[PDB]
């Protein structure tokens, strides 16, 4: 088992590495269709790289690279999309937001750190399972928490795994930077969940629409961090149609495997989206989801965050293009 995964570790040790500037990840509508889990892990190395965090927080080298590969192997392989590739798109949106979006001139590097680590810990060791499934399939982790249990578990495994061996990038942090780190990451991973985002977002939009937002008023700023977090948690929708076909029809088939679990180990009367029958009407039910979080968040992420506009546009392009499959 592990012998093959560590053979993949030699694939890290013995394969060509295309540059991130060659691999279009700065382009928000990037083609992740051709990347392997290894290459996406390498892009994740870029995501820890350019955010000026390793210099500001003294991250260890290979401990970080194999932070990335360990989080890579830890995902259960039965899962469709909600694996390492999900973290790839999420922290793609995060890295792109904090560099291509050029927000660093605004918000502090501490916050860049919280944004990045919470972005890669938006969905650690995701089991093809959202909060509700364990809330009703009753995995022990569910009883271990209450609200946003997968994400309370993602903060739990943030503070745990980063303190766990092979992952101590927090080791170089000063106690203040470390404190702001795990705390802002706590609230943000709570907000990496789209839900507690829906909870926290209203104060943000009230503080954004009037162009009265200010970064010398730090709680509002951290709230912006959380908004970017949730903006990143669903970033897979930003991808191009030949690819997005794969991505959101794996949203289809993966919530249809999870939905098979919703109609075997759960046996609920089917809801329209995760019912397989609506293969020709699922995408509209994505839109009602997409409008519920994506566009609403990327509008504010448009009026404040700037170059991050395509992160909105790269989603909207899918709309009618999925409506086509939603139109049988």
């Amino acid at each position, epitope marked *: 088992s592990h012998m093959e995964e560590t053979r993949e570790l030699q694939s890290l040790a013995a394969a060509v590495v295309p540059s991130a500037q060659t691999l279009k990840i700065t382009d928000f509508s990037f083609s992740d269709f051709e990347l392997s889990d290894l290459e996406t892990a390498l892009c994740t190395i870029r995501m820890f790289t350019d955010l000026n965090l390793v210099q500001n927080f003294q991250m260890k080298h290979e401990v970080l690279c194999r932070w990335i590969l360990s989080v890579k192997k830890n995902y259960r392989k039965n899962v469709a999309y909600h694996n390492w590739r999900h973290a790839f798109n999420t922290a793609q949106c995060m890295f792109a937001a904090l560099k291509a979006g050029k927000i660093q001139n605004k918000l502090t590097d501490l916050e860049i750190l919280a944004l990045l680590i919470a972005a890669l810990s938006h969905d650690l060791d995701h089991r093809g399972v959202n909060n509700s499934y364990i809330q009703r399939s009753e995995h022990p982790l569910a009883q271990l928490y209450c609200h946003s249990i997968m994400e309370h578990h993602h903060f739990d495994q943030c503070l745990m795994i980063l303190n766990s061996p092979g992952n101590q990038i927090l080791s170089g942090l000063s106690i203040e930077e470390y404190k702001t780190t795990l705390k802002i990451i706590k609230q943000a991973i709570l907000a990496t969940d789209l839900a507690l985002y829906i909870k926290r977002r209203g104060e943000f939009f009230e503080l954004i629409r009037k162009n009265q937002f200010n970064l010398e008023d730090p709680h509002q700023k951290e709230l912006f961090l959380a908004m970017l977090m949730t903006a990143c948690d669903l970033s897979a929708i930003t991808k191009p149609w030949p690819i997005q076909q794969r991505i959101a029809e794996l949203v289809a088939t993966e919530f249809w495997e999870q939905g098979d679990l919703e*109609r*075997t180990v759960l046996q609920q009367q089917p809801i329209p989206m995760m019912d397989r029958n609506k293969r020709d009407e699922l995408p509209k039910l994505q839109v009602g989801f997409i409008d519920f979080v994506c566009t609403q968040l990327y509008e504010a992420l448009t009026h404040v965050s700037e170059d991050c506009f395509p992160l909105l546009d790269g989603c909207r392009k899918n709309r009618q293009k999925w409506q086509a499959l939603a139109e049988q």
Partner: antibody
Amino acid sequence: EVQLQQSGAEVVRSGASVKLSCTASGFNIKDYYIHWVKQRPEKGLEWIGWIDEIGDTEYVPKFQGKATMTADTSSNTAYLQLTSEDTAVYYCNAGHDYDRPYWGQGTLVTVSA
Amino acid sequence: DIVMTQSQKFMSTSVGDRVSITCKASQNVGTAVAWYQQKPGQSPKLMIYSASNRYTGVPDRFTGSGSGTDFTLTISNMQSEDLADYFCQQYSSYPLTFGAGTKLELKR
């Protein structure tokens, strides 16, 4: 060898419904699509309808309003409640759910008054 | 929809001869193709899946391919057991459709 199985040759009276079966074996259909089909002799195995892991029945219009499927995934079974062409060999198969391979003998129904 | 017509039915060819069980999709199906070993009054077996990949337990002497539209189950090293029905199927698209069947015959 992995195999589906069904009732053998039967001679029902005209106007009398005949309760067909499709007992899959050698694999759980608990994760699989199941597809009923008809064979009027030496012709295309004309389609009847199908059922998914969702457990909801589905029919061809030819058998919709006529045929009455009752199927279950954990039981790996698909019943099919039901002319000289209907006097036929009814087959049924399967498919992986992630996918977009085994058969019963084909129930030889014979309808005549 | 996509009918799986088979012009092949009752060819009379000698044992060990190569033979082709033609079939034809009316529309594109991709590589998602499934050949089958039918018998009257008795259980059919799978022959081929994914255009090329073969059924578990059927002999490899058979060949079975074709894709998109044109299809052909070219039985090779044909035997008397091979002289039974065969039908093409798409698992590619709903409703699934099926071959006319083809009861191969030994030549004499």
